[PDB]
């Protein structure tokens, strides 16, 4: 078991989460089983209990673990599936030694930081890197870990102890720590200093860098580059830099070429480190699908433009899943994606009474989008604004797909204006009026993988196609309210087809709607399953009926 | 005697001059007999044996000291003479002890850095803040440090040990340290833990800050300045900035709107200091003085181009006190500058054998000019690109000023041209030519202050007219060659007036020409002696006849 | 070139000396060229402008260059001689660099700590390491370098700087670091925590130890041999222990019977220095005559007490190369040495009119003595003292050895008693009184080695039977005033005969006195050439007369 521990630096909100990613994904093309876990000095145990205002997502693993959004790029990169276990807490480690020692288990010893954290720390990184994350069986060969927050914090500070004994009891040629750092370009001059204070700080703590990422302003200078060496020793060819290009998908290719797996597969022996022919022969095909893709996104012109419509699009964090699924798709197809920001606050009337210029830009860039997508965040407060997406793609011919609220304000526009029951409702919204037509029932939340089956009257219909024509999926769920299953059989007699469902045929996953050219929803999130080289299928349906070719994607993915 | 001292940083190579300075001069006024110290950790004893290519000027005292740069920054702010002891270094203040130990006054004593050196830096900062600075034999009232480099450096370890026994041997309400920090911006965030990072460590060597003050690429977010109060304990009012403005001037009248007189006035109970109501109509003159004169810089707009003509240009520190000295003629004048930076190497003819553009750019930029400065740096390689630009100004009536290198180009020019002697030249250049009109000879350098004398017959002469129609001059030198003396009288017979004189009459240090608008020389740097608030003579001339208006600057002068 | 460097601790005023010199000594019995450096970090150029109230000895080179006590530990421990450049200052490598800035040879750069004196530290031991300091002309193989002061001091601070880019421009296996460290005893507890803050401090400047030596008041548990390791990382087998023995001479067998030969000889890859079979012969001969001297220094009882007399013995540290040349001498005869510190101010009558109590305690000491001593400090306030000593060994047949100023009370004494002039005396002492018998001249003093010379009319003396019978001596002097040449004749046909003289005859250096048992001094100090296996003869000489076997002695040495 290797380990590669990215680190450090001056300010916490720099650039670990792309340089490790990116190490996970060259290691990768190494053939090797590569592993990936986050160490975050927060003390939250695990995200269900933190809202979408900071740090994003509340992302889903397939144990149902709402998990920290850096989890999900590690995922997206690498093709594999974490445990919950893969992201390390502040609170989760002080809550295991805790739940350990009111059991008894310490013998009655006085429990201290050293060694008892730091133990702690390390059995759970030895038990979590053998865990298999892969499509077959076998334990992990390199384990990247992203240390959160910086060498030198109050939080971080038993991990860095934790990971200083770590390294000695894995030896050296079995771990390796790469330190990401500033260096500041101040009157057009690249300024070291933070980058060596920063490493007084990070050798008191006894830890040793064996690369240094820089990010700047600029690429770095020679002389920079031989001033950080000098006094932070690594070699000229140790020192990296992950400037700003347009791209954040390049970064693995600029490392490439800086000889970073060079130095990895030298400084962890990786040669040695046994691999079949087949696992060399997919490392190479992991590189040139990587090229080949990433000159589909250099030499592609033609915008595709799609209407992203929610709450709090100012935080463009939030839907940070939704916005990379859509590039995974966009990639795929090899169209420009452009995502319109729509705010669904803006697109109802009422809007009109307080600023008419946020009406009309909101339906300006929804009268502009190639397709729509109302993906579903959390609360209430702008169901109306997504039911007049709902209506304007299906009165429009406009490419459509609803995810998890999706769903149900799709079937919420359905009811009020196909069936035409004007008071039909979301229950979550308004549960006191107590109605006959309540499109949301409570079934606390059904979460992580589950089995979905297809109806089997669904041969002709475009989502089964872009899943294979299987008769099962499997996708990750967040969804508290549900639809109503004694509705469902008006709204399929109206041509409002629920293609997918629970095994037990009381809960309902999947709609296509008749005639329509594309619209479509999903109970299931299917952001959380996409991977950058194999596109989640909602979503390159959407692209590729905003793009044209739909026919085609369907033919490509029938051979 | 009161001390500010101005500190710190994570970068050397960021805020503390302008600070300084800035705090120099809102603190006159209040009245108060400013005085400043720099402390350079650098070894270097004294500037002259150190090039232009590093830290610019070779900067000239009263005392005739070759000193460092930032000591003109306090002069031509401060309106204030400083002597050589006013420049600390890490050599000086090693080369002093160990000049004492050899001397045997230690008696017999193991010479230890503590005390001994923590010693002589602080009896030197008290030997020194006492000298009189002023246009009046009183001794200072406060006294700015400037500690150069960074708290947390191997050089400047004894400065700041020396500085806290300092701040406890002169107690707090006597002394005040400002700390400039840097707070980065990434990714549209504010990010503190530079300037966290870097507390620590000056904290850990005992010195406390009462101000932070920032360099920033935005103001200061509310968010960020409680989030340094907070962690670098200083009180809301107490972080201040000091931003990216097109005006270096404009600084003082920033750090008042951010009120920090009113926090020094307290932090340092100068209310408590004697003065007089003289001093405090001083005070609000210098205040009200410097207002007005902004006023001037922001309403102008009618641009006048001033040809600087030199080596090494790229480097534009290499021209600092030319460079300032001409805005402070320039804001006198209520008129724009811009300089042209013109290559010496490029006039040259033989230029355009080698490139054309450079040949045509050099022209372009000197035909533009509304006047032509010969500023003088080190070495002969251009003397020949600047006897062209001493020439065009000569045949072309463009306004024209040369000092020291300046005179004896436009001499050999004169010579060359209006004697008609092809082969007269610079000594320095061509001494194995041994020739009978040798425009340079040898008199190791006339260094620091001297008298210069007008010759009688000088009442015509605008260049007198400026210094005031006065007997007698007092400026500053450099000069190891001189114009020889034999040559004079045929020159002045063809009307290049040797104006200015040594009262031994063998050294000839002013030229003015007849019949042209104007053409001067000096052989004392006339740079060095411009206040901002009274601009040097020969430069206001050289502006004010680039600018028109000569003839009432003239008779504005002699009310 | 391999280095080992001492270094560290908490407190300075631990163990580094007794340790770096041990080390020396048991790479010499590799039978490897060890040569040794100090770096001391006070100011002071050298020795002889410092009196020995502070750090003891003004110790004497062959160059004749007052150094730091501590050279002279490596010199009678290693058997070699080192040249002034062999000890390294603060005030040394600064006074160097600013000698060669004024001189211009910095090509006018800035000069700054880093990299330029960190280049002439490194510059300094890559000259000094090399200069041959054995009986061959050959160069060094291991440099010892004692970095005096702690890691983690304002004056050490660029000593460290320089050590850490050494470290890196001379690699590992060919520089290793050894950390001397306090391990406090509390409550009976071996508490760790002040050896793993100050490796904090120790890393964060770069440095890594490769041996932790511990100063404590016991042995290390094993427990805290553990607790030092798996903090401040190194083996359980590199941790060491330097623990209270009552002979300094064993702290070499301790660091053998804790295989630190075994350790550096794996750490500098010694295995791979060429050495022939001859050097390993006299490695296992060092080795062993080391063993055999401890041998007799663990079974020998028999007391012979060495009156030693002067001024200040309360500071022990005074005389320190006389105490250790004595044990040598005391070693080589097998015989348990004691000395009676005596207090010349004590001896004199006038004593007994302030403290009836020292003046017996003093005689009473003097009586008790098998031999007597006056090795000459500095200052006359005790002269008379010492002439009651010249004058109780003379007429009562106790062995004596008079050094340097031993000389000239011994003259005095001579003059004054068996010449029968009561006023002649010492001219530094009573220079007023102009006499005609004036014992004392000036001839600012002759230092270093000088060649002495035997007067021919000698075969029967013992002081030069004891030098082997030879013809000339070499040896190292301080003296300004000496015996007057004119007197000299009268003496000598009384029967004190100067048996050795400078080449000129003007200058007289030895004498031995007729009928006495054993009656000699010295003007040259016989202390600074004494090594440990080889013993200085005026010294090997008192104690074999104060023990008796003098003839057995003079015997063996004339074999
Ligand atoms: N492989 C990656 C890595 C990062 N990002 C983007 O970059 C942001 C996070 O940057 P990251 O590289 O993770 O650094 P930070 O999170 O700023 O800080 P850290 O060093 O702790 O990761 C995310 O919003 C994400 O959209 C991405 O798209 N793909
Ligand atoms: N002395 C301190 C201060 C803060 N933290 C940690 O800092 C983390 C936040 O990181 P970052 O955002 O990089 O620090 P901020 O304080 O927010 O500063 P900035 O404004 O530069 O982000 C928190 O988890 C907190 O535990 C720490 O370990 N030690
Ligand atoms: N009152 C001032 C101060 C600075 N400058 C300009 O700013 C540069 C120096 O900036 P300064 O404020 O002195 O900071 P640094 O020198 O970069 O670093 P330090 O903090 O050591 O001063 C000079 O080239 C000078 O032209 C100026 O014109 N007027
Ligand atoms: N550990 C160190 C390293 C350097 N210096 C000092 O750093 C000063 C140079 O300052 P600065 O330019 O701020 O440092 P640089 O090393 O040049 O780094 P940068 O590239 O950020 O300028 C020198 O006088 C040198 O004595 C120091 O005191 N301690
Ligand atoms: N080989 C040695 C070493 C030391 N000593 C004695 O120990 C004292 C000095 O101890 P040392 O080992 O040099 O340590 P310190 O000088 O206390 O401190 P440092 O670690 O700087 O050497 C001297 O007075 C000396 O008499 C000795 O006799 N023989």
Redesign the interface.
């Known amino acids: 078991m290797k380990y590669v521990v990215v680190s450090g630096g001056?300010?916490?909100?720099?650039g670990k989460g792309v340089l490790a990613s990116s190490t996970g994904m060259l290691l990768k093309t190494l053939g090797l089983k590569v592993t990936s876990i986050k160490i975050d000095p927060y003390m939250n145990i695990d995200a269900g209990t933190m809202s979408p205002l900071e740090h994003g997502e509340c992302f889903v693993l397939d144990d149902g673990g709402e998990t920290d959004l850096d989890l999900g790029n590690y995922e997206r990169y690498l093709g594999i599936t974490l445990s919950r276990d893969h992201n390390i807490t502040t609170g989760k480690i002080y809550s295991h030694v805790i739940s350990r020692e009111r059991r008894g288990d310490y013998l009655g010893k006085t429990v201290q930081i050293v060694p008892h954290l730091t133990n702690a720390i390390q059995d759970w990184i030895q038990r979590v890197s053998k865990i298999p994350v892969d499509d077959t069986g076998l334990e992990p060969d390199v384990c990247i870990i992203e240390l959160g927050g910086?060498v030198?914090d109050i939080e971080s500070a038993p991990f860095v102890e934790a990971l200083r004994?770590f390294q000695?009891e894995v030896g050296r040629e079995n771990f390796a720590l790469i330190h990401v750092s500033?260096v500041?370009v101040?009157?057009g001059?690249q300024?070291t200093?933070?980058t060596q204070?920063?490493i007084?700080?990070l050798?008191?703590?006894?830890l040793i860098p064996d690369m240094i990422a820089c990010?700047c302003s600029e690429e770095l200078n020679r002389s920079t580059i031989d001033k950080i060496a000098?006094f932070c020793?690594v070699g000229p060819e140790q020192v990296v830099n992950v400037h700003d290009v347009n791209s954040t998908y390049h970064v693995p290719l600029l490392l490439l070429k800086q000889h970073m797996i060079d130095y990895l597969h030298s400084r962890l022996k990786l040669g040695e480190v046994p691999l079949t022919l087949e696992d060399k022969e997919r490392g190479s095909q992991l590189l040139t699908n990587w090229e080949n893709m990433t000159k589909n996104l250099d030499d592609s012109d033609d915008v595709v433009k799609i209407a992203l419509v929610g709450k709090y699009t100012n935080l463009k964090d939030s839907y940070l899943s939704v916005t990379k699924s859509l590039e995974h798709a966009s990639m795929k197809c090899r169209r420009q994606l452009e995502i319109l920001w729509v705010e669904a606050s803006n697109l109802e009337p009422e809007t009109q009474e307080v600023d008419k210029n946020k009406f009309h830009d909101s339906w300006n860039k929804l009268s502009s989008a190639d397709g729509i997508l109302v993906p579903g965040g959390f609360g209430t407060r702008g169901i109306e604004g997504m039911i007049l997406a709902a209506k304007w793609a299906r009165e429009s011919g406009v490419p459509f797909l609803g995810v998890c609220l999706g769903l149900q304000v799709a079937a919420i526009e359905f009811a009020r204006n196909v069936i035409g029951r004007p008071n039909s409702s979301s229950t979550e919204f308004l549960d006191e009026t107590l109605l006959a037509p309540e499109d949301q029932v409570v079934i606390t939340m059904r979460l992580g993988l589950r089995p979905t089956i297809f109806q089997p009257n669904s041969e002709w219909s475009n989502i089964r196609k872009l899943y294979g024509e299987v008769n099962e999926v499997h996708e990750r769920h967040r969804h508290r309210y549900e639809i109503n299953p004694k509705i469902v059989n008006d709204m399929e007699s109206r041509g409002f087809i629920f293609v997918g469902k629970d095994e037990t045929g009381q809960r309902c996953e999947i709609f296509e709607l008749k005639g329509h050219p594309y619209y479509v929803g999903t109970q299931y999130h299917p952001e959380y399953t996409s991977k950058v080289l194999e596109p989640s299928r909602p979503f390159w349906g959407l692209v590729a009926a905003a793009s044209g070719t739909l026919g085609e994607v369907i033919k490509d993915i029938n051979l």
């Open positions: 001056v300010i916490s909100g720099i910086t030198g004994q000695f500033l500041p101040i009157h001059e300024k200093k933070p204070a920063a007084k700080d050798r008191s703590l006894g990010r000098m020793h």
